[PDB]
Amino acid sequence: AEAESALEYAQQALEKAQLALQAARQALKA
Amino acid sequence: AEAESALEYAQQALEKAQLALQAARQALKA
Amino acid sequence: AEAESALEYAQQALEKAQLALQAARQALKA
Amino acid sequence: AEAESALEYAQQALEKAQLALQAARQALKA
Ligand SMILES: c12c3c4c5c1c1c6c7c2c2c8c3c3c9c4c4c%10c5c5c1c1c6c6c%11c7c2c2c7c8c3c3c8c9c4c4c9c%10c5c5c1c1c6c6c%11c2c2c7c3c3c8c4c4c9c5c1c1c6c2c3c41
Ligand SMILES: c12c3c4c5c1c1c6c7c2c2c8c3c3c9c4c4c%10c5c5c1c1c6c6c%11c7c2c2c7c8c3c3c8c9c4c4c9c%10c5c5c1c1c6c6c%11c2c2c7c3c3c8c4c4c9c5c1c1c6c2c3c41
């Protein structure tokens, strides 16, 4: 239901934040 | 540049995760 | 219970990520 | 420097949020 869908979406959103964060960390190392 | 865009995206992704989490939180107490 | 505690912790963790992200975004602007 | 430390902390915070979210996800299906 809504709660489950919300947590799945949240996890997906966090995954996207993480991959963008990794790109940014690499960019700073240069 | 890429680093700035990445952090902006990450912040937006986290905002999305937070609002879904708040929905889930309310659903639980419901 | 555990689910509620988990979501509260998760929200707190995300809040901490967000404030660190804001510091980083400011640092890049300089 | 500060920017690097901030992103490292943010990434660690998000990791923590994700593991709590996975616990919550399991609790729901339970
Ligand atoms: C990567 C960079 C590049 C690649 C990496 C991919 C992902 C992530 C990073 C990273 C940033 C990079 C670069 C940059 C390119 C490039 C590519 C690569 C892909 C990848 C995807 C993601 C992912 C995020 C990640 C951030 C992160 C930002 C970084 C930037 C730029 C920039 C730009 C490109 C471009 C493409 C495109 C891909 C697309 C993916 C996603 C998302 C999004 C993330 C963001 C965003 C930032 C931002 C932009 C664009 C842009 C968009 C788009 C795609 C999107 C999308 C997103 C963002 C866009 C935009
Ligand atoms: C701020 C910076 C500074 C202030 C801002 C505060 C918060 C956040 C940022 C930011 C980064 C900054 C600077 C830096 C100082 C400074 C201060 C300020 C405080 C604040 C707290 C948070 C918060 C995070 C934020 C990040 C972010 C990093 C940034 C860095 C350094 C650096 C450093 C200092 C120092 C203090 C200290 C405070 C403490 C808070 C938290 C957390 C943590 C966040 C992280 C971490 C990064 C990292 C370190 C330390 C360190 C620690 C500690 C405190 C901690 C803590 C954390 C991290 C430590 C560490």
Author numbering:
A (entry chain B), B (entry chain A), C (entry chain B), D (entry chain A): 1 to 30
Source paper text:
In this work, we demonstrate the first ever high-resolution structure of co-assembly between a protein and buckminsterfullerene (C60), which suggests a simple structural mode for protein–fullerene co-organization. Each tetramer presents four tyrosine residues (one per monomer) in exterior c positions of the coiled-coil heptad, and each of these engages a C60 moiety. One C60 is wedged between two Tyr residues donated by adjacent tetramers, such that two tetramers are needed to coordinate one C60.
Crystals from the resulting suspension grew within 24 h in several conditions, and three separate structures of the C60Sol–COP complex were resolved to 1.67, 1.76 and 2.35 Å, respectively. Furthermore, the three different COP–C60Sol co-crystals obtained under different conditions all produced effectively identical binding interfaces and assembly geometries, arguing that fullerene may have a strong preference for the observed coordination geometry. The interaction between COP and the fullerene group involves non-polar contacts, with C60 fitting perfectly into a symmetric hydrophobic cavity created by helices of two adjacent COP tetramers. The dominant contact appears to be the π–π aromatic stacking between C60 and Tyr9, donated by each tetramer, while several aliphatic carbons line the pocket to further support the bound pose. The water-solubilizing Tris-acid side chain of C60Sol is not visible in the electron density map. The group likely points into the solvated inner channel of the crystal and is highly mobile as the C60 core rapidly rotates around its centre. On the other hand, there is considerable difference in the arrangement of COP tetramers in the corresponding crystals: COP alone assembles into a body-centered cube, while C60Sol–COP has a honeycomb structure with parallel hexameric channels. In fact, in the fullerene bound structure, no contacts between adjacent COP tetramers occur outside of the C60-binding site. Inter-fullerene nearest-neighbour distances in the C60Sol–COP supercrystal alternate between 1.2 and 1.7 nm. On the other hand, C60Sol–COP supercrystals (of similar dimension as protein-alone crystals) exhibited high electrical conductance (1.40 × 10−7 S, corresponding to resistance of 7.14 × 106 Ω) with at least four orders of magnitude higher currents than in any of the controls.
